[PDB]
Design an enzyme around this catalytic site. Structure first.
Site, PDB file in Angstrom:
ATOM      1  N   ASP A  60      15.184   5.138 -13.689  1.00  0.00           N
ATOM      2  CA  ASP A  60      15.680   3.881 -12.354  1.00  0.00           C
ATOM      3  C   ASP A  60      16.738   2.861 -13.672  1.00  0.00           C
ATOM      4  N   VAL A 115       0.958  -1.000   0.188  1.00  0.00           N
ATOM      5  CA  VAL A 115       0.220   0.089   0.582  1.00  0.00           C
ATOM      6  C   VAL A 115       0.651   1.183  -0.077  1.00  0.00           C
ATOM      7  N   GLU A 167       3.570  -1.132 -10.634  1.00  0.00           N
ATOM      8  CA  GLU A 167       4.817  -0.739  -9.999  1.00  0.00           C
ATOM      9  C   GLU A 167       5.642  -0.587 -10.919  1.00  0.00           C
ATOM     10  N   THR A 187      11.046  10.413   0.117  1.00  0.00           N
ATOM     11  CA  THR A 187      10.502   9.117   0.810  1.00  0.00           C
ATOM     12  C   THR A 187      11.993   8.629   1.791  1.00  0.00           C
ATOM     13  N   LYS A 188      12.925   9.789   2.121  1.00  0.00           N
ATOM     14  CA  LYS A 188      13.490   9.537   3.484  1.00  0.00           C
ATOM     15  C   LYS A 188      12.787   9.551   4.738  1.00  0.00           C
ATOM     16  N   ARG A 198      -6.505 -23.456 -39.944  1.00  0.00           N
ATOM     17  CA  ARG A 198      -6.913 -22.651 -40.767  1.00  0.00           C
ATOM     18  C   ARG A 198      -6.972 -22.250 -42.464  1.00  0.00           C
TER      19      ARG A 198
HETATM   20  C1  LIG Z   1      -3.930  -1.778 -12.203  1.00  0.00           C
HETATM   21  C2  LIG Z   1      -3.551  -1.447 -10.814  1.00  0.00           C
HETATM   22  C3  LIG Z   1      -2.916  -2.038  -9.738  1.00  0.00           C
HETATM   23  C4  LIG Z   1      -2.562  -1.367  -9.092  1.00  0.00           C
HETATM   24  N1  LIG Z   1      -2.133  -1.898  -7.739  1.00  0.00           N
HETATM   25  C5  LIG Z   1      -1.413  -1.104  -6.330  1.00  0.00           C
HETATM   26  C6  LIG Z   1      -1.368  -1.521  -5.800  1.00  0.00           C
HETATM   27  O1  LIG Z   1      -1.096  -2.444  -5.064  1.00  0.00           O
HETATM   28  N2  LIG Z   1      -0.174  -1.064  -4.875  1.00  0.00           N
HETATM   29  C7  LIG Z   1       0.461   0.356  -5.147  1.00  0.00           C
HETATM   30  O2  LIG Z   1       1.501   0.912  -4.664  1.00  0.00           O
HETATM   31  N3  LIG Z   1       0.227   0.671  -6.320  1.00  0.00           N
HETATM   32  C8  LIG Z   1      -0.570   0.321  -7.298  1.00  0.00           C
HETATM   33  N4  LIG Z   1      -1.047   0.764  -8.374  1.00  0.00           N
HETATM   34  C9  LIG Z   1      -0.077   1.872  -9.025  1.00  0.00           C
HETATM   35  C10 LIG Z   1       1.476   1.965  -9.076  1.00  0.00           C
HETATM   36  O3  LIG Z   1       2.372   1.429  -8.719  1.00  0.00           O
HETATM   37  C11 LIG Z   1       1.526   2.637 -10.297  1.00  0.00           C
HETATM   38  O4  LIG Z   1       3.329   3.402 -10.190  1.00  0.00           O
HETATM   39  C12 LIG Z   1       0.474   4.226 -10.520  1.00  0.00           C
HETATM   40  O5  LIG Z   1      -0.160   3.655 -11.453  1.00  0.00           O
HETATM   41  C13 LIG Z   1       1.778   5.312 -11.226  1.00  0.00           C
HETATM   42  O6  LIG Z   1       1.599   6.269 -10.895  1.00  0.00           O
HETATM   43  P1  LIG Z   1       0.530   7.343 -11.616  1.00  0.00           P
HETATM   44  O7  LIG Z   1      -0.811   6.585 -11.638  1.00  0.00           O
HETATM   45  O8  LIG Z   1      -0.138   8.283 -10.195  1.00  0.00           O
HETATM   46  O9  LIG Z   1       0.451   7.669 -12.536  1.00  0.00           O
HETATM   47  P2  LIG Z   1       1.397   9.683 -12.819  1.00  0.00           P
HETATM   48  O10 LIG Z   1       2.790   8.936 -11.870  1.00  0.00           O
HETATM   49  O11 LIG Z   1       0.779  10.169 -12.558  1.00  0.00           O
HETATM   50  O12 LIG Z   1       1.747   9.732 -14.198  1.00  0.00           O
HETATM   51  C14 LIG Z   1       1.809  10.162 -15.514  1.00  0.00           C
HETATM   52  C15 LIG Z   1       2.155  10.148 -16.614  1.00  0.00           C
HETATM   53  O13 LIG Z   1       3.278  11.017 -16.247  1.00  0.00           O
HETATM   54  C16 LIG Z   1       4.622  10.270 -16.380  1.00  0.00           C
HETATM   55  N5  LIG Z   1       5.463  10.014 -15.366  1.00  0.00           N
HETATM   56  C17 LIG Z   1       5.542  10.789 -13.936  1.00  0.00           C
HETATM   57  N6  LIG Z   1       6.908  10.769 -12.952  1.00  0.00           N
HETATM   58  C18 LIG Z   1       7.117  11.270 -14.276  1.00  0.00           C
HETATM   59  C19 LIG Z   1       9.055  11.722 -14.080  1.00  0.00           C
HETATM   60  N7  LIG Z   1       9.607  11.863 -12.934  1.00  0.00           N
HETATM   61  N8  LIG Z   1       9.765  10.880 -15.289  1.00  0.00           N
HETATM   62  C20 LIG Z   1       9.084  10.925 -16.252  1.00  0.00           C
HETATM   63  N9  LIG Z   1       7.861  10.905 -16.496  1.00  0.00           N
HETATM   64  C21 LIG Z   1       7.058  11.160 -15.676  1.00  0.00           C
HETATM   65  C22 LIG Z   1       4.676   8.624 -16.177  1.00  0.00           C
HETATM   66  O14 LIG Z   1       5.515   8.111 -16.215  1.00  0.00           O
HETATM   67  C23 LIG Z   1       3.054   9.089 -16.922  1.00  0.00           C
HETATM   68  O15 LIG Z   1       3.159   8.591 -17.982  1.00  0.00           O
HETATM   69  C24 LIG Z   1      -1.199   0.272  -9.607  1.00  0.00           C
HETATM   70  C25 LIG Z   1      -2.143   0.459 -10.740  1.00  0.00           C
HETATM   71  C26 LIG Z   1      -2.612  -0.074 -11.462  1.00  0.00           C
HETATM   72  C27 LIG Z   1      -2.809   0.414 -13.108  1.00  0.00           C
HETATM   73  C1  LIG Z   2     -15.839  -6.129 -36.766  1.00  0.00           C
HETATM   74  C2  LIG Z   2     -15.776  -6.689 -38.166  1.00  0.00           C
HETATM   75  C3  LIG Z   2     -16.147  -6.061 -39.325  1.00  0.00           C
HETATM   76  C4  LIG Z   2     -16.536  -6.756 -40.466  1.00  0.00           C
HETATM   77  N1  LIG Z   2     -17.689  -6.013 -41.339  1.00  0.00           N
HETATM   78  C5  LIG Z   2     -17.792  -6.061 -42.875  1.00  0.00           C
HETATM   79  C6  LIG Z   2     -18.986  -5.938 -44.123  1.00  0.00           C
HETATM   80  O1  LIG Z   2     -20.267  -4.629 -43.659  1.00  0.00           O
HETATM   81  N2  LIG Z   2     -19.403  -7.078 -44.766  1.00  0.00           N
HETATM   82  C7  LIG Z   2     -18.380  -8.042 -45.237  1.00  0.00           C
HETATM   83  O2  LIG Z   2     -18.390  -8.428 -45.995  1.00  0.00           O
HETATM   84  N3  LIG Z   2     -16.993  -8.362 -44.178  1.00  0.00           N
HETATM   85  C8  LIG Z   2     -16.907  -7.826 -43.259  1.00  0.00           C
HETATM   86  N4  LIG Z   2     -15.534  -8.088 -42.285  1.00  0.00           N
HETATM   87  C9  LIG Z   2     -14.734  -9.122 -42.444  1.00  0.00           C
HETATM   88  C10 LIG Z   2     -13.743  -8.598 -42.813  1.00  0.00           C
HETATM   89  O3  LIG Z   2     -13.547  -7.805 -44.161  1.00  0.00           O
HETATM   90  C11 LIG Z   2     -13.068  -9.897 -42.736  1.00  0.00           C
HETATM   91  O4  LIG Z   2     -12.163 -10.345 -41.207  1.00  0.00           O
HETATM   92  C12 LIG Z   2     -11.046  -9.901 -43.164  1.00  0.00           C
HETATM   93  O5  LIG Z   2     -11.489 -10.008 -44.501  1.00  0.00           O
HETATM   94  C13 LIG Z   2     -10.502 -11.487 -42.824  1.00  0.00           C
HETATM   95  O6  LIG Z   2     -11.074 -12.493 -43.110  1.00  0.00           O
HETATM   96  P1  LIG Z   2     -10.720 -14.007 -42.206  1.00  0.00           P
HETATM   97  O7  LIG Z   2     -11.420 -13.463 -41.407  1.00  0.00           O
HETATM   98  O8  LIG Z   2     -12.326 -14.346 -42.848  1.00  0.00           O
HETATM   99  O9  LIG Z   2     -10.186 -13.895 -42.111  1.00  0.00           O
HETATM  100  P2  LIG Z   2      -8.655 -14.899 -42.281  1.00  0.00           P
HETATM  101  O10 LIG Z   2      -9.228 -14.614 -44.057  1.00  0.00           O
HETATM  102  O11 LIG Z   2      -9.134 -15.440 -42.278  1.00  0.00           O
HETATM  103  O12 LIG Z   2      -7.304 -14.271 -42.153  1.00  0.00           O
HETATM  104  C14 LIG Z   2      -6.261 -15.250 -40.923  1.00  0.00           C
HETATM  105  C15 LIG Z   2      -4.757 -14.497 -41.480  1.00  0.00           C
HETATM  106  O13 LIG Z   2      -4.695 -15.062 -41.793  1.00  0.00           O
HETATM  107  C16 LIG Z   2      -4.076 -14.065 -42.665  1.00  0.00           C
HETATM  108  N5  LIG Z   2      -4.138 -14.413 -44.574  1.00  0.00           N
HETATM  109  C17 LIG Z   2      -5.487 -14.534 -45.034  1.00  0.00           C
HETATM  110  N6  LIG Z   2      -4.963 -14.576 -46.427  1.00  0.00           N
HETATM  111  C18 LIG Z   2      -3.679 -14.517 -46.736  1.00  0.00           C
HETATM  112  C19 LIG Z   2      -2.816 -14.754 -47.702  1.00  0.00           C
HETATM  113  N7  LIG Z   2      -3.099 -14.366 -49.003  1.00  0.00           N
HETATM  114  N8  LIG Z   2      -1.615 -13.900 -47.670  1.00  0.00           N
HETATM  115  C20 LIG Z   2      -0.811 -13.278 -46.644  1.00  0.00           C
HETATM  116  N9  LIG Z   2      -1.862 -13.575 -45.563  1.00  0.00           N
HETATM  117  C21 LIG Z   2      -2.477 -14.294 -45.667  1.00  0.00           C
HETATM  118  C22 LIG Z   2      -4.540 -12.801 -42.877  1.00  0.00           C
HETATM  119  O14 LIG Z   2      -3.895 -11.370 -43.215  1.00  0.00           O
HETATM  120  C23 LIG Z   2      -4.764 -13.076 -41.428  1.00  0.00           C
HETATM  121  O15 LIG Z   2      -3.913 -13.107 -40.679  1.00  0.00           O
HETATM  122  C24 LIG Z   2     -16.308  -7.405 -40.907  1.00  0.00           C
HETATM  123  C25 LIG Z   2     -14.753  -7.492 -39.872  1.00  0.00           C
HETATM  124  C26 LIG Z   2     -14.954  -7.751 -38.356  1.00  0.00           C
HETATM  125  C27 LIG Z   2     -13.747  -7.472 -37.672  1.00  0.00           C
END
Ligand SMILES: Cc1cc2nc3c(=O)[nH]c(=O)nc-3n(C[C@H](O)[C@H](O)[C@H](O)COP(=O)(O)OP(=O)(O)OC[C@H]3O[C@@H](n4cnc5c(N)ncnc54)[C@H](O)[C@@H]3O)c2cc1C
Ligand SMILES: Cc1cc2nc3c(=O)[nH]c(=O)nc-3n(C[C@H](O)[C@H](O)[C@H](O)COP(=O)(O)OP(=O)(O)OC[C@H]3O[C@@H](n4cnc5c(N)ncnc54)[C@H](O)[C@@H]3O)c2cc1C
Lengths: 609, 608
Positions: free
Chosen positions: A456, A163, A447, A224-225, A326
């Site tokens: 760091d 915490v 973290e 921190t200290k 596939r």
């Molecule tokens: C899912 C989740 C679980 C967590 N669980 C825990 C937990 O159990 N216990 C706990 O103690 N904490 C926990 N945290 C907090 C965690 O350790 C992070 O340190 C914290 O989220 C980061 O600080 P912040 O969110 O206030 O961001 P900020 O410090 O506000 O940072 C915002 C942005 O500013 C940048 N930034 C800030 N200071 C600098 C600097 N000096 N130099 C460069 N860039 C900087 C950051 O990199 C970031 O891009 C959790 C966070 C998450 C997301």
């Molecule tokens: C949110 C969403 C909405 C969509 N809406 C529409 C719509 O309104 N109407 C419609 O007609 N379609 C629609 N699509 C379909 C979409 O165009 C297809 O998902 C897409 O063309 C890929 O086909 P597939 O999912 O069968 O993948 P696959 O063709 O099976 O591809 C699988 C993997 O193999 C790779 N691969 C396949 N063939 C080759 C090749 N010849 N060379 C190299 N790599 C290859 C692909 O790049 C991919 O990484 C939608 C899809 C999504 C996700």
């Protein structure tokens, strides 16, 4: 089958064929643990992970925890609590725990290889189970009396939290304002609000929670200290028997709605604000909080990096299985023949490129964290590297920001390829990859952000260390480069260029820092380049360890490997060569970019963004 | 206000200060649209987008559509339908529609700038609103009688769909098995199951839906050449009056649960499977489906690319505003002073690097799609580039895979930086970035995966074009490189990047030529094609950003003050940052492409 696809074979290869952790098995601290037993433990937890742990992965995301304001508690989905009971019932929360707390002594490299499976299958399950390990840290830093409570906590399986974070103190931990007020009886009253606290409540999983809370004693100085660490239990308890007594004044007030990792309850935590005091005990009865929180830090960084690679690995293996099945399109050699047979998509060049990218980074990250873990036991480091305890500790310290920072950034980025391999189906919740991505985004934040990791690493783990750990690792890479098979010549040449590239980045950045004494703004170029440098070091280490694995794989193939082993070894040779030719050369352009950094982006008016 | 943060100022900069779309407004096809009306229209749709449209962005994701399998219909959240009505009430579903269909004639560059606001504020709202644009494509390809129906559909605001994909035919469109059975009276009965169809049901938003369905006439040949396109309405209607009649046999049978874009109903569509024929009319009464569906595909690609940049842009501006307000840590120049004042995080170098990366890529992508759109009207291409209609068409064709493929990959990746800027808060649904990311992951899959985009780019838009469009663009980059001292380093870096991309194109072309002798050499084209497409995108981004900086320098030199001055200074900073930090990587990528090999093709599948 479940979503979770494990890779015990690759872990065993690293542990026993590459790094030689079996040399320390069966002797001294690990007298009670042979290599055969270690192998069987890995197979067993992988099965548990693939079975009852993964069973609730989808449910925890789709039916997430609910905060109850009528009781200041969190309710968890029943299927996830069943998974937690399977973990506890098998004793897995006590792996690598000290023997006197009830644990099984084992090298840290083996411990993290076991935890990888839980992190891949349902990573919040490991997070809720970090109690015993935090009890061990409290044991090691506590007074003799406190060690008695820590023993109780370990043996009763209490939960635990770390915490630190507050609304205005996240990256800048030293800005915390949570207060500690000493009481006449020598306890303390902790007063303040903390944010983002993982597992701050956990339904009825545990009979108590140990909160380890950073707070500022009244009158203490700034930064921190001035921070101290306090043991603040959810329930008062009998300091001799462990019997649970009255509620302590530490209450969850909200549960965050997150992109992913939804079944990990992430809470706002109020101390002393709900009518009763949050009673705390100063850890070690000394004021030394940040230094005491150190081993918690290191554990959390290892956990995040192992989680990232665990998730990438199962994302890759899910994509691979899909791609093998596939059927889509003709072979590119038959593009012009519209009578051509349709082929499985593993025949397409872009798909093989994608899969080899996923494979190489997954395996390279695994090698990195297990390499790192061979420096976390003095015994292991001496046996496998011939390094003494002080240098091993400094090398571990150097590598952890890589495990965490590089791992977190790489896994999320390469899961993009995993989803892409499924085509449109990867955008569906029916397949696990979209949840892997959502669950993985937290890795770059938990973290400490990537930029904090990278600062760091450079300021503390290199500059303050005067480069000693970094020199050691560089010398190991150079020894590999200078060792004389001809089948790894081009890899060694590409690695030599990458080593020189990273050395040039380090020198440029070091120059910018030293020049800050004359020109204060020069330091900003260190900040501009820090993250790219960290990622470049990760890529170098990846390429070097993949090449080391390829060297072992060549020996094993020459010795006559066959069948599924032969296929495994050929894949290691292919991944090392692919990574060297396709990932390492980009570090040359990055070196030149870092050598050409300027202050223009720092001089720009904020109103111009 | 809302989640959606717009950037009209940058759009007007591109449209009127960089590309000169001003020059065609007020004359010929755009006689009754002047530059002042165009600026007012941008401001108006941006205000609508930030208000009523964006109002339901969260609701659509958190309370997503629900399917009733017995009625074959979806229920959309009420607040999302209210957003849709705000869009229809302002006539925004008819932006760029032909005047004879009720539209306001406008350059395509203005049209996509208007649309950008809808895509940023609630991208599924624009997608449901694509009916009238699809009706105009049906009009243009239709018989005289079909043109009457298209006019009805456009004027009444019918929805529409493009219906290609099947479970076994996604990338491989030519493998489609849906069939068309000719009837004696010249209509067809369509029979099959399609998948992933966007908007195949849309609750009660529209009176009807025009499904444009690809299907294979019984007995036709294999592949894409054997496919025809059919007008298949949800409801039959009176062909003279438009009065909606009885239900046609085309029914949604599943609605997918997706990572994001949840309010866009993505449907399994069954034709002819429920005892009722799916009656279809052959589009144009000719068998020419893939060619007809092409104008639909090009609209889809422009749409996806504009959506990608719209989302990155609002993601960046949300991150910037957060970073301006968030106090954390001391200035890096005061690291050692524990008494140092805390600063806002825009003081930290890594945050400024992150924000400039987000800014440069958002603005570079915006310039790319506006540039592309200046080739989509012959008279715009004439007046602003001096190129004829044929070359203009081939340049638009070359650029669309960049808009789509480079945009989709870039926006999702750089939104990672936007989320990181917020720290732990970025992981919370309380802020919009995590939904931007989930909604954007579809961009690399919709209308053809990135690999398909990059293979189309190389084989069709370069090799089959004999490099003519590519050489035109390269010649424009070269003229910019050759043309004052303040952009010298940017011009030098662009010259390297241009040579790098030309070197990659030569290497891949060489691998294709070697395939005449060793068929397996072609696989190297596949291995490198996506990296090549991403490199051409980075080069165009860098060039267009540098052209923007040149204009910005002119305006500063002339005496810009105030907010204009800040805007122009940012343009110069972004172009310089991009040239020094993104472009040099293409040099290593060129070397990697030169060194491609077939080792990964020869590896046993069992070894992965
Ligand atoms: C899912 C989740 C679980 C967590 N669980 C825990 C937990 O159990 N216990 C706990 O103690 N904490 C926990 N945290 C907090 C965690 O350790 C992070 O340190 C914290 O989220 C980061 O600080 P912040 O969110 O206030 O961001 P900020 O410090 O506000 O940072 C915002 C942005 O500013 C940048 N930034 C800030 N200071 C600098 C600097 N000096 N130099 C460069 N860039 C900087 C950051 O990199 C970031 O891009 C959790 C966070 C998450 C997301
Ligand atoms: C949110 C969403 C909405 C969509 N809406 C529409 C719509 O309104 N109407 C419609 O007609 N379609 C629609 N699509 C379909 C979409 O165009 C297809 O998902 C897409 O063309 C890929 O086909 P597939 O999912 O069968 O993948 P696959 O063709 O099976 O591809 C699988 C993997 O193999 C790779 N691969 C396949 N063939 C080759 C090749 N010849 N060379 C190299 N790599 C290859 C692909 O790049 C991919 O990484 C939608 C899809 C999504 C996700």
């Amino acid at each position: 089958m479940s979503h979770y696809k494990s890779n015990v074979r690759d872990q065993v290869f690293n542990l026993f064929e590459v790094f030689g952790v079996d040399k320390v098995l069966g002797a001294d601290k690990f007298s009670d643990l042979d290599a055969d037993t270690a192998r069987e433990m890995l197979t067993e937890i992988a099965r548990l992970a693939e079975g009852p742990i993964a069973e609730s992965f989808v449910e925890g995301d789709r039916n997430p925890p609910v905060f109850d304001p009528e009781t200041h508690t969190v309710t968890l989905p029943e299927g996830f609590k069943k998974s937690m009971r399977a973990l506890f019932d098998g004793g897995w929360d006590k792996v690598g725990l000290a023997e006197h707390l009830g644990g099984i002594p084992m090298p840290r490299a083996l411990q993290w290889a076991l935890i990888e499976h839980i992190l891949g299958a349902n990573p919040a399950a490991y997070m809720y189970a970090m109690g015993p390990g935090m009890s061990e840290i409290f044991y090691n830093n506590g007074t003799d009396e406190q060690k008695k409570w820590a023993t109780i906590a370990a043996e009763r399986g209490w939960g635990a939290t770390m915490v630190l974070t507050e609304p205005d103190a996240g990256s800048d931990v030293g800005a915390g304002r949570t207060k500690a007020v000493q009481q006449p009886d020598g306890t303390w009253h902790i007063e303040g609000v903390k944010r983002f606290i993982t597992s701050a409540d956990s339904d009825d999983l545990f009979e108590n929670i140990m909160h380890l809370v950073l707070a500022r004693p009244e009158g203490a100085g700034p930064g921190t200290k001035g921070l101290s660490l306090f043991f603040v239990p959810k329930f008062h308890f009998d300091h001799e028997t462990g019997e649970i007594g009255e509620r302590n004044g530490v209450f969850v007030t909200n549960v965050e709605h997150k992109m992913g990792l939804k079944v990990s309850a992430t809470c706002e935590l109020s101390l002393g604000q709900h009518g009763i005091p949050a009673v705390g005990w100063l850890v070690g009865e000394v004021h030394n909080g940040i230094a005491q929180m150190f081993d918690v830090i290191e554990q959390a960084r290892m956990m995040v990096g192992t989680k990232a690679i665990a998730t990438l690995s199962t994302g890759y293996l899910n994509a691979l299985e899909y791609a093998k099945e596939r059927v889509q399109g003709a072979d590119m050699t038959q593009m012009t023949d519209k009578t051509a047979p349709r082929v499985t998509i593993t025949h397409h060049p872009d798909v093989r490129r994608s899969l080899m990218t996923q494979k190489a980074y997954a395996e390279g990250l695994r090698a990195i964290y297990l390499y790192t873990a061979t420096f976390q036991d003095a015994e292991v480091a001496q046996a496998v590297h011939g390094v003494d305890g002080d240098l091993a500790a400094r090398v571990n310290d150097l590598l952890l920001p890589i495990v965490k920072g590089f791992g977190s950034e790489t896994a999320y980025a390469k899961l993009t390829e995993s989803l892409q391999t499924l085509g449109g189906s990867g955008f569906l919740q029916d397949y696990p990859i979209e949840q892997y991505i959502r669950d993985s985004k937290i890795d770059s934040l938990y973290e400490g952000t990537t930029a904090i990791q990278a600062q760091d690493f450079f300021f503390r783990k290199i500059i303050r260390d005067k480069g000693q750990a970094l020199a050691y690792v560089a010398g190991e890479i150079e020894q590999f480069i200078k060792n004389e098979n001809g089948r790894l010549k081009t890899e060694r040449e590409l690695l030599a260029t990458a080593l020189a590239d990273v050395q040039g980045m380090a020198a440029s950045l070091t120059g910018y820092l030293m020049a800050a004494q004359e020109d204060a703004a020069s330091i900003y170029k260190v900040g501009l380049g820090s993250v790219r440098f960290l990622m470049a070091v990760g890529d170098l280490l990846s390429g070097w360890l993949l090449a080391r694995q390829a060297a072992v794989a060549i020996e094993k193939l020459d010795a006559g490997a066959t069948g599924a082993d032969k296929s495994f070894y050929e894949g290691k040779i292919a991944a090392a060569s692919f990574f060297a030719k396709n990932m390492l050369p980009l570090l040359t352009s990055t070196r030149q970019i870092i050598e050409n950094l300027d202050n223009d982006v720092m001089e720009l008016d904020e109103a111009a963004f």
